Ligand binder design. Structure first.
Ligand SMILES: OC[C@H]1O[C@@H](n2cc(-c3ccc4ccccc4c3)nn2)[C@H](O)[C@@H](O)[C@@H]1O
Length: 810
């Protein structure tokens, strides 16, 4: 059908068809007479999977012979989404499979919709890990993703009476064709127990044992025949566990609960024992696997030359004292040498500056669960603080500020401090974020060891986030500049010479309209809701949080509604406002925000005077597969976090690559995006970081804004009096109270500029030609935000390895 989707050769199509029929018969034990769409999906998945295995075995063989430095990316989250189409794209199989299935009388796009998302993450941090795995394979690095195979991923979100309801994400119900269980490589993990001191050092004894069973999933590079591995650990009880009889067998569930469920919190720390167990489980099993592989190449001096461990936030921070434990207690290395190895091996990436998101574990928890690790942490702390004292003599407050141990009612360990101490590199995820780290929360550490601190601006994979989800746009780009940009996104700059090209302008606008029509149809077919495809698609999709300010968006929506009600027969640019994302189950305010959005929709969508000029839709169950649908359809991307709160954002980059314009604050990666495209081509508004600081020093008074802005006053009065909740007039009292008396994120402070900026958006949208020309300038300068660039920087500046675009033999 289209160029970028590969060749459909006679030989390939014939071979695909027969292997599809083989799997249906032998693997699924079905015939065409009883087969369902689901059976057809699985036959296709198995057929494509077969094409991976040869490459997978030969890639891993290649690494064994060449013995390169290995990269271990440790994360508690891998937000993978669907795998079928991604695999076809990276193997150049999409058109061939499309043809093969067509000839069998099947629609492949229908089959693709059957696959469950692998939802083993919450949002941005989990998705970054997934994009990173794709780029590492594409860049030919010997890289392994290590995590937990959760039985239940992020919950499925249902909306009932405007409220979020959670249901279990039973993603393994029908099986996972992409994983391979590896029970032969099962490893033991220890918990509890006590420490004994002997003449021959410390020993950790009387422990409870949980088995870690690995499951391997292939990670194909883009058309380079490289297939890397994501290894996810599953918890298993040992066979003598608790071994009246029946109860002892039933009690095995206690051990196996470790890998049962993903903690559903975005940017928020919950200090529960089960979570700590998950963190150690992944770390202990992973490190044994690493050391085993290293020994199969005595001398640990070469360890940092052959191993890099990247910590995705502090969640796997126990890798630091666990590596020390192994080197000191088991390999019998002296402390100083073990520490040198550890530091040179580990690197740490921070993803937030919000105080409530920082991991601070109660000492009493670590004392019971991991008694030896606590001892090691204390020793790390003592030695680190002796270094601080020597560098800054007499500075007693610096000592208490920098300590890994926090004093108070309950003593806690600051895991971020642990990570900085035990890593050779610490990075933030966008330039402004990395600067904030050096200037504020890690200032003391930057003063002691400035060389450790780096920036690595985030990126997204252009495979999933352009070629896969937006083939129409990928194709029109390929028509002009070729296909090489797919693995070299900087080449999109060549599109600047097409900004006054009348054919290209028409094609860019055509692709967007097609995307909007397709998405408008999706909403009717699957959710029975009517939208106008000619309206401006105004979208804010991401996890619900106060810092992300979905509430500011809400205020604008109501402002637009109130202005229409005031002057009904005045022309306004029609908008479809779409807001989606999940709230953490215990996050009350976020659940209230969802209810507000739906409540506004209930008033706005049924007002006859409004017509089809304004629609407010809550996008249910936002997840990777839904992102792939809505992002290509968007006209306006809402990136409106209070300056200084969104470390980077990655959703922003997805919208930029797919032809939406951005309205946003100068926060996270928005700053670099505007810098790349030109500020004239971005809708920037609101306080900068410096303005927020000035407001904090003076004291933020929300009443001031309420008093001086009549349009804002009206909205607050509407919310208070029960305009949006007639049956329950006080339903939104918590929201109003928060806004008026304890708003950490200064919603009112940016309201006027936001509304003004939104008017400028509507003005430009009235001129289709100039809207599209600005879009082209955005797409053309989005190259920096490829995760290929990001990973190349980690490789060269942190891991000390060279990326390669060279093919492995097929
Ligand atoms: O770096 C990738 C993205 O990471 C996002 N993020 C951060 C987190 C996060 C931070 C701290 C946590 C602490 C405990 C549990 C979960 C956590 C998640 N989840 N997502 C950040 O919010 C976003 O700015 C960034 O683009």
């Amino acid at each position: 059908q289209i160029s970028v989707r590969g060749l459909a050769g006679v030989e390939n199509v014939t071979e695909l068809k027969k292997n599809f029929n083989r799997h249906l018969h032998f693997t699924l034990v079905k015939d065409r007479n009883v087969a369902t769409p689901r059976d057809y999906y699985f036959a296709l998945a198995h057929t494509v999977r077969d094409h991976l295995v040869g490459r997978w075995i030969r890639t891993q063989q290649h690494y064994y012979e060449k013995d390169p430095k290995r990269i271990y990316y440790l994360s508690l989250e891998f937000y993978m989404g669907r795998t079928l189409q991604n695999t076809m794209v990276n193997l150049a199989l999409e058109n061939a499979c499309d043809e093969a299935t067509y000839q069998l009388g099947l629609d492949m796009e229908e089959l693709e919709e059957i696959e469950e998302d692998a939802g083993l993450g919450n949002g941005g941090l989990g998705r970054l890990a997934a994009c990173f795995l794709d780029s590492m394979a594409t860049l030919g690095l010997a890289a392994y993703g290590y995590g937990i195979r959760y039985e239940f991923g992020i919950f499925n979100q249902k909306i009932c009476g405007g409220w979020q309801m959670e249901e279990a994400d039973d993603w393994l119900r029908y099986g996972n064709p992409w994983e391979k269980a590896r029970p032969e490589f099962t490893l033991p993990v220890h918990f509890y127990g006590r420490v004994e001191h002997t003449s021959q050092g410390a020993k950790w004894v009387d422990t409870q044992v949980v088995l870690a069973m690995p499951y391997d999933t292939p990670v194909p590079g883009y058309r380079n025949n490289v297939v890397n591995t994501m290894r996810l650990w599953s918890a298993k009880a040992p066979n003598d566990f608790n071994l009246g009889y029946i109860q002892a067998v039933l009690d095995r569930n206690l051990a196996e609960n470790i890998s049962r469920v993903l903690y559903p919190n975005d940017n928020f720390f919950e200090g529960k024992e089960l979570r700590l167990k998950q963190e150690y489980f992944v770390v202990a099993a992973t490190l044994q696997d690493i050391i085993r592989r290293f020994k199969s190449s005595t001398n640990f001096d070469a360890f940092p030359d052959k191993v890099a461990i990247q910590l995705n936030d502090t969640h796997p921070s126990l890798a630091i004292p666990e590596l020390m434990r192994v080197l000191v207690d088991l390999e019998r290395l002296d402390w100083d040498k073990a520490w040198e190895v550890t530091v040179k091996t580990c690197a740490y990436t921070n993803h937030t500056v919000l105080p409530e998101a920082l991991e601070r574990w109660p000492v009493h928890l670590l004392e019971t669960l991991l008694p030896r690790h606590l001892q090691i942490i204390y020793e790390i702390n003592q030695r680190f603080l002796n270094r601080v004292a020597a560098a800054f003599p007499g500075d007693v407050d610096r000592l208490r500020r920098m300590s890994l141990v926090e004093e108070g009612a309950v003593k806690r360990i600051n895991m971020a401090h642990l990570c900085i101490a035990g890593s050779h590199a610490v990075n933030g995820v966008a330039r402004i974020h990395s600067e904030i780290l050096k200037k504020t929360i890690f200032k003391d550490f930057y003063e002691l060891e400035p060389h450790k601190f780096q920036n690595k601006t985030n990126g997204i994979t252009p495979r999933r986030w352009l070629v896969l989800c937006n083939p129409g746009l990928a194709e029109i780009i390929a028509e002009r500049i070729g296909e090489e940009y797919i693995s070299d996104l900087d080449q999109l700059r060549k599109l600047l010479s097409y900004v006054d090209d009348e054919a290209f302008i028409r094609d860019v606008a055509k692709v967007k309209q097609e995307n909007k029509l397709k998405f408008a149809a999706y909403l009717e077919r699957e959710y029975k809701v009517h939208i106008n495809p000619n309206s401006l698609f105004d979208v804010q999709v991401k996890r619900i949080h106060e810092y992300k300010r979905q509430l500011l968006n809400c205020l604008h929506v109501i402002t637009l509604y109130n202005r229409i009600k005031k002057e009904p027969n005045k022309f306004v640019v029609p908008r479809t406002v779409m807001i989606g994302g999940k709230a953490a189950p215990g996050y009350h305010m976020a659940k209230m925000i969802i209810k507000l959005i739906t409540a506004i929709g209930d008033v706005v969508n049924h007002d006859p005077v409004v017509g089809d000029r304004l629609r407010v839709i809550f996008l249910e169950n936002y997840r990777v597969s839904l992102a792939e649908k809505v992002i290509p359809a968007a006209d306006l991307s809402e990136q409106i976090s209070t300056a200084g709160t969104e470390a980077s954002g990655t959703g922003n980059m997805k919208f930029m690559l797919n032809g939406a314009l951005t309205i946003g604050t100068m926060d996270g990666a928005n700053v670099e995006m505007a810098e790349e495209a030109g500020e004239e081509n971005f809708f920037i508004f609101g306080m900068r970081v410096e303005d927020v600081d000035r407001l904090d020093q003076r004291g933020y008074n929300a009443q001031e804004y309420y008093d001086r802005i009549p349009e804002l006053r009206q909205i607050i009065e509407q919310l208070s009096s029960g305009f949006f909740s007639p049956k329950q007039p006080d339903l939104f009292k918590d929201i109003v109270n928060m806004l008026m008396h304890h708003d950490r994120f200064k919603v009112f402070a940016d309201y006027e500029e936001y509304v003004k900026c939104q008017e400028r958006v509507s003005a430009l949208y009235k001129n289709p030609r100039e809207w599209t020309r600005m879009v082209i300038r955005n797409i053309a300068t989005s190259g920096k935000f490829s995760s290929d660039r990001t990973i190349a920087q980690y490789a060269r500046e942190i891991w000390g390895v060279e990326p390669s675009r060279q093919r492995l033999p097929a």
